[PDB]
C-alpha cells in the first residue's frame, strides 16, 4: 500500500533508469518503514545491479515523513553493496529547512552523503529534466502543481536570529518560501524551498506595512517576513487560505 | 464548533431574525446532538418568543449529518409550543436525495412539516433573496462557493430504478446533480441537489459515448448518468478530482 512513495519513471541523459522517492508520501507510523524499504528493495533489485539514478522529491517533507535513526540506519545497510555504488546520481528536489535540519540531526548517519558529488540538488523541475530523457521529468503531479500560477515576491526577508533572503511564492494551494541565499545541506550549498500548504496556514498577520507573520499549523513559532509589498503578500495568502477553507470538509 | 452549526444572522424581509442551520456541520452522535440542541436552545431562547425564521442549509447533508431517530424526536418536544409557531418560515436550501429519503423515513415525526406553507424550499439559490435580502443572507461562504464557476451540463439523465432528468454541475470542488424535474419532500415539489465533493468522487467511469458513472465514497451504489457530452463531463470531473488529489495531505 505504498507503491507511490517510490516509483520508477524515465531514464537519464546518462542512460540510466530514474527512480523517484516522494518523501512526503511516506509516513513514519502508519506506512511501516518495513513496507517501504520492502517496496524500494523490490523495484530496485532488477535494477540496482546496473547503474541507476534516483530523484528524491523532498517536497514538503516534514517530521511525519522522517526516517527515524533506526530506520535511516537500516537504509545504509540493507542493500547489496554494489546497489549503493550503482546509484549514478540522486537528484534532490525541493529540499527544505526541515530536511536540512534533519540532515544535521542525523549527520552521524548521513556522513557518507556529505560532500558526495552524486547528490545533485535541483532548484526546479526544469533543471531536473535536463538530466533526463528529453526532459521528461516525472516528479509527482502534486509537486509539479506547486510550480504553476505563482505570485512571486522577491527580495523578501525571513526574520529570525539569522535573517534569510527569500522569495515568497504564493500559489493557489501553497506558499513557498524559497531561500535566495544558499546554505549547506549535506555539505552542498543549496537553495531551500519551504512549502506551506494553505491547509497549514492557521494565521496570517500583518505586523507592519512591510512585515508579516505566518503561523503554520504545528510549527509553533510563526514565521516572520519583511518585504516592501507585505500587505499584498498577506492578502494573497489570506486569499489562498480562504479559497482553501471554502473547500474544507464538513 | 456546534457554534457554526446553528447561528443567528440577518433579518428577513418580514422583519424576522434569521437563524441558519448548516446541516453538514453537524456530525451524528452522542454528545454532538446535545451540544447542538443545547446550542440551538441558548441561541433561540432570546428570540423564539417572537417570529423568527430559519434557513436550513442542507447542502451536502448526508448520513453522517443525520439526527438519529431518538435525537430528531427531541427537536419537536424540547422547545416551547410558541417557539415552533413563531418560526414564520423555514427556507430549505439545497435539499438533496439523502435528506428527501431521510424525511421519507421519518415521514412520521415530520408530519407537522409535511405540507407546511412555512417551509420554503430554495430551488433557486436566488429565490432565497425573495424573503431575505442578500446583504442579510449569511449562508456559509462555502455553500455560496458551490454556486460559482459551475460548468453546467443541462439535460443529463440519472439512471437508477427511476431515471430522473438532472443537470450535472461540475465546479472546482464538487459535482452537483440537480434534478431538472421536481420531487416531493415533505409534500412539496422541489428540486433536489445532490452534491458530491471532489473528495468523495472515487471512481470516474466513461461507460460509453453518452454515459458515465461516479462511484461515491461510502456509497456502494454508483451514480450513473447519461448525457450527450459525457466524455466532457467525465473529463470535467476527472479534472476536479485530480485537481483535488493534487492538493491533499501527504
Ligand atoms: C540507502 C538509502 C539512502 C536513504 C537516505 C535517507 C536520508 C535522506 C535525507 C534527505 C536528504 C538526502 C536525500 C538523498 C539521499 C541519497 C542517499 C544515497 O545516495 O544512498 C546511496 C544509495 O542510494 C540508494 O540506495 C537508492 C535510493 C534508495 C531510497 C532513498 C530514499 C531517501 C528518503 C529520504 C526521506 C527524507 C528524509 C527523512 C527525514 C526525517 C548509498 O550511499 P553510500 O554509498 O554512502 O552508502 C554506504 C553504506 N551502504
Ligand atoms: C424543532 C426542530 C425541527 C427539526 C427538524 C429536523 C428534521 C429536518 C429534516 C430535513 C428537512 C426539513 C428541514 C426543516 C425542518 C423545519 C421543522 C420546523 O419547522 O419545526 C418547527 C420549529 O422550528 C424550530 O424549532 C426552529 C428551527 C430549529 C432547528 C432545526 C434544525 C433542523 C436540522 C435538520 C438536519 C437535516 C436532517 C438530518 C438527517 C438524518 C415546529 O414544527 P411543528 O409546529 O410541527 O412542531 C410541533 C411539535 N412542537
DSSP letters for B55-73: EEE-TT--GGGPPPHHHHG
Cα A108 to ligand 1 centroid, rounded to whole Å: 13
Instruction: Give, in words, the CATH class of B140-250.
Output: mainly beta
- Restricting to B residues 23-42, those with a Cβ less than 8 Å away from any Cβ of A are 24-25, 27
CA distance B26 to B22: 8
What one-character DSSP code corresponds to residue B18?
E
Q: For B65-160, where are the alpha helices, taking DSSP H only?
A: 69-72, 81-86, 97-105, 141-145
Taking the CA atoms of residue A223, residue A227, residue A233 and residue A238 in that order, the dihedral angle to the nearest 10 degrees is 40
Please, which residues have CB within 8 angstroms of residue B55's CB and are 6 or more apart in sequence?
Answer: B18, B19, B20, B21, B90, B91, B92, B93, B122, B128, B132, B137, B139
Cα A201 to ligand 1 centroid, rounded to whole Å: 30
Question: With an 8 Å Cβ cutoff, is A245 touching chain B?
Answer: yes
Contacts of A248 in chain B (CB under 8 A): 142
Please, which residues have CB within 8 angstroms of residue A54's CB and are 6 or more apart in sequence?
Answer: A18, A19, A20, A21, A87, A89, A90, A91
CA distance A204 to A224: 10
CA distance B68 to B111: 17
What one-character DSSP code corresponds to residue B36?
H
CA distance A168 to A229: 11
Give the number of C-alpha atoms closer than 13 A to the C-alpha of residue A78, restricted to the C-beta side: 17
Q: Which chain B residue is nearest to residue A23, measuring alpha carbons?
A: B250
CB-based contact A247 B141, cutoff 8 Å: no
Asked if residue B225 lies in contact with residue B177, where contact means CB atoms within 8 angstroms, the answer is: yes
Does the C-beta of B84 come closer than 6 Å to ligand 2? Answer: yes
Please, which residues have CB within 8 angstroms of residue A174's CB and are 6 or more apart in sequence?
Answer: A60, A146, A195, A196, A197, A198, A240
Q: Ligand 2, closest atom to CA B68? A: 40
Phi-psi region at B133: left, alpha or beta (left = phi > 0; alpha = psi -120 to 50): beta
Please, which residues have CB within 8 angstroms of residue B126's CB and are 6 or more apart in sequence?
Answer: none
CA distance B109 to B105: 9
Nearest to B250 among A60, A145, A250 (CB): A60
- CA dihedral sign of residues A12, A14, A15, A16: negative
DSSP states along chain A: --TTTEEEEEEBTTS-EEEEEETTT--SSSS-HHHHHHHHHHHHTTTTTS-EEEEEE-TT--GGG---HHHHHHTTSSS-HHHHHTEEEEEEES--HHHHHHHHHTTTTGGGGTT-TTEEEESSHHHHHTTBGGG-----HHHHHTTSSEEEEEEEEE-SSS-EEEEEEEETTEEEEEESS-EEETTEEE--EEEEEGGGEEEEEEEETTEEEEEETTS-SPEEEE-TTHHHHHHHHHHHHHHHHHT---
Q: In degrees, to the nearest 5, what angle opens at C-alpha B59 toward C-alphas B79 and B87? A: 25
CA distance A179 to A191: 6
Question: With an 8 Å Cβ cutoff, is B173 touching chain A?
Answer: yes
Taking the CA atoms of residue B184, residue B199, residue B175 and residue B4 in that order, the dihedral angle to the nearest 10 degrees is 60
Closest CA to B18 of B120, B146, B147, B145: B120
Q: Which chain A residue is nearest to residue B141, measuring alpha carbons?
A: A246
Does the C-beta of A87 come closer than 6 Å to ligand 1? Answer: yes
Q: In what order do the strands lie in the sheet with B201-208?
A: B193-197, B174-179, B164-171, B151-159, B219-226, B211-216, B201-208
Q: Which long-range contacts (CB under 8 A, 24 or more apart) does B2-5 make?
A: B2/B26, B2/B32, B2/B35, B2/B36, B2/B39, B3/B39, B4/B140, B5/B36, B5/B39
N- to C-terminal Cα separation, chain A? 27
Q: How was this structure determined?
A: X-ray
Cα A133 to ligand 1 centroid, rounded to whole Å: 23
- Restricting to B residues 96-135, those with a Cβ less than 8 Å away from any Cβ of A are none
Q: How many whole angstroms from its chain centre is CA A221?
A: 21
Q: What is the CATH number of domain B1-139?
A: 3.40.525.10
Q: Which chain B residue is nearest to residue A58, measuring alpha carbons?
A: B250
- Cell digits of residue B62: 448526508
Identify from A171, A246, A248 which residue to disrupt to test chain B contact, counting B C-beta atoms within 10 A and taking the largest count: A246
Asked if residue A86 lies in contact with residue A52, where contact means CB atoms within 8 angstroms, the answer is: yes
Asked if residue A28 lies in contact with residue A65, where contact means CB atoms within 8 angstroms, the answer is: yes
What one-character DSSP code corresponds to residue B228?
T
Closest CA to B39 of B24, B19, B62, B68: B19
Distance from CA of A85 to the nearest CA of B (A): 30
Please, which residues have CB within 8 angstroms of residue B39's CB and are 6 or more apart in sequence?
Answer: B2, B3, B5, B6
Residue B10 in 3-state DSSP?
A: strand
Residue B27 in 3-state DSSP?
A: coil
Residue bearing the CA closest to ligand 1, atom 20:
A84
- Cell digits of residue A105: 540531526
Asked if residue B53 lies in contact with residue B18, where contact means CB atoms within 8 angstroms, the answer is: yes
CA distance A179 to A154: 10
Closest CA to A76 of A113, A49, A30: A113
- Cell digits of residue B133: 435580502
- Cell digits of residue A115: 560532500
What one-character DSSP code corresponds to residue B174?
E
* Number of helical (H) and strand (E) elements in chain B, helices listed first: 6, 14
Asked if residue B19 lies in contact with residue B10, where contact means CB atoms within 8 angstroms, the answer is: no
Question: With an 8 Å Cβ cutoff, is B241 touching chain A?
Answer: no
From the CA atom positions of chain A, what is the Rg in Å?
A: 19
Size of interface A-B (CB pairs under 8 A): 40
Nearest to B250 among A65, A141, A173 (CB): A65
Phi and psi at A59, nearest 5°, equal -50, 125
Pinpoint the residues of chain B covered by CATH 2.30.29.30. 140-250
Please, which residues have CB within 8 angstroms of residue A127's CB and are 6 or more apart in sequence?
Answer: none
Asked if residue A207 lies in contact with residue A224, where contact means CB atoms within 8 angstroms, the answer is: yes
Phi and psi at B136, nearest 5°, equal -100, -10
Question: With an 8 Å Cβ cutoff, is B159 touching chain A?
Answer: no
Closest CA to B179 of B241, B121, B108, B245: B121
Question: With an 8 Å Cβ cutoff, is B65 touching chain A?
Answer: yes
Please, which residues have CB within 8 angstroms of residue A136's CB and are 6 or more apart in sequence?
Answer: A10, A129
Q: Which chain B residue is nearest to residue A245, measuring alpha carbons?
A: B142
Which class for A139: exposed (0-12), middle (13-18), buried (19 or more C-beta within 10 A)? buried
Residues composing chain A: 250
CA distance A16 to A4: 20
What one-character DSSP code corresponds to residue B113?
T
Residue B217 in 3-state DSSP?
A: coil
Does the C-beta of B192 come closer than 6 Å to ligand 2? Answer: no
Asked if residue A244 lies in contact with residue A199, where contact means CB atoms within 8 angstroms, the answer is: yes
CA distance A179 to A166: 4
Please, which residues have CB within 8 angstroms of residue A180's CB and are 6 or more apart in sequence?
Answer: A154, A155, A164, A165, A166, A167, A191
Does the C-beta of B105 come closer than 6 Å to ligand 2? Answer: no
Q: Which long-range contacts (CB under 8 A, 24 or more apart) does A227-236 make?
A: A227/A153, A227/A155, A227/A156, A227/A157, A227/A168, A228/A155, A229/A153, A230/A206, A231/A206, A232/A153, A233/A153, A233/A156, A233/A168, A233/A170, A234/A204, A234/A205, A234/A206, A236/A151, A236/A170
CA distance A39 to A32: 11
Which class for A15: exposed (0-12), middle (13-18), buried (19 or more C-beta within 10 A)? exposed
CA distance A177 to A179: 6
| Cβ neighbours of B73 (radius 10 Å) | 14
Pinpoint the residues of chain B covered by CATH 3.40.525.10. 1-139
The residue assigned the cell 436550513 is B56
Amino acid at each position: 500500500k505504498t507503491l507511490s512513495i517510490f516509483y520508477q519513471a524515465g531514464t537519464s541523459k546518462a542512460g540510466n533508469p530514474i527512480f523517484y522517492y516522494v518523501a512526503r508520501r511516506f509516513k513514519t507510523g502508519q506506512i511501516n518503514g518495513d513496507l517501504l524499504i520492502y517496496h524500494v528493495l523490490l523495484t530496485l533489485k532488477p535494477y540496482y545491479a546496473k547503474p541507476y539514478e534516483i530523484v528524491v522529491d523532498l517536497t514538503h517533507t516534514g517530521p511525519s515523513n522522517r526516517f527515524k535513526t533506526d530506520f535511516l540506519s537500516k537504509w545504509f545497510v540493507v542493500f547489496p553493496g554494489f546497489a549503493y555504488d550503482n546509484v549514478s546520481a540522486v537528484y534532490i528536489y525541493n529540499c527544505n529547512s526541515w530536511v536540512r535540519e534533519y540532515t544535521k540531526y542525523h549527520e552521524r548517519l548521513l556522513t557518507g552523503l556529505k560532500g558526495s558529488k552524486r547528490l545533485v540538488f535541483i532548484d526546479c523541475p526544469g533543471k531536473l529534466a535536463e538530466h533526463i530523457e528529453h526532459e521528461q521529468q516525472k516528479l509527482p503531479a502534486a509537486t509539479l502543481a506547486l510550480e504553476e500560477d505563482l505570485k512571486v515576491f522577491h527580495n523578501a526577508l525571513k526574520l529570525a536570529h539569522k535573517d534569510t533572503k527569500v522569495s515568497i511564492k504564493v500559489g493557489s494551494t501553497a506558499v513557498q518560501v524559497t531561500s535566495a541565499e544558499r546554505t549547506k545541506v549535506l555539505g552542498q550549498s543549496v537553495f531551500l524551498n519551504d512549502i506551506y500548504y494553505a491547509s497549514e496556514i492557521e494565521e496570517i498577520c500583518l505586523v507592519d506595512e512591510n512585515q508579516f507573520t505566518l503561523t503554520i499549523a504545528n510549527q509553533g513559532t510563526p514565521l516572520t517576513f519583511m518585504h516592501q509589498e507585505c500587505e499584498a503578500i498577506v492578502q494573497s495568502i489570506i486569499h489562498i487560505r480562504t479559497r482553501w477553507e471554502l473547500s474544507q470538509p464538513d
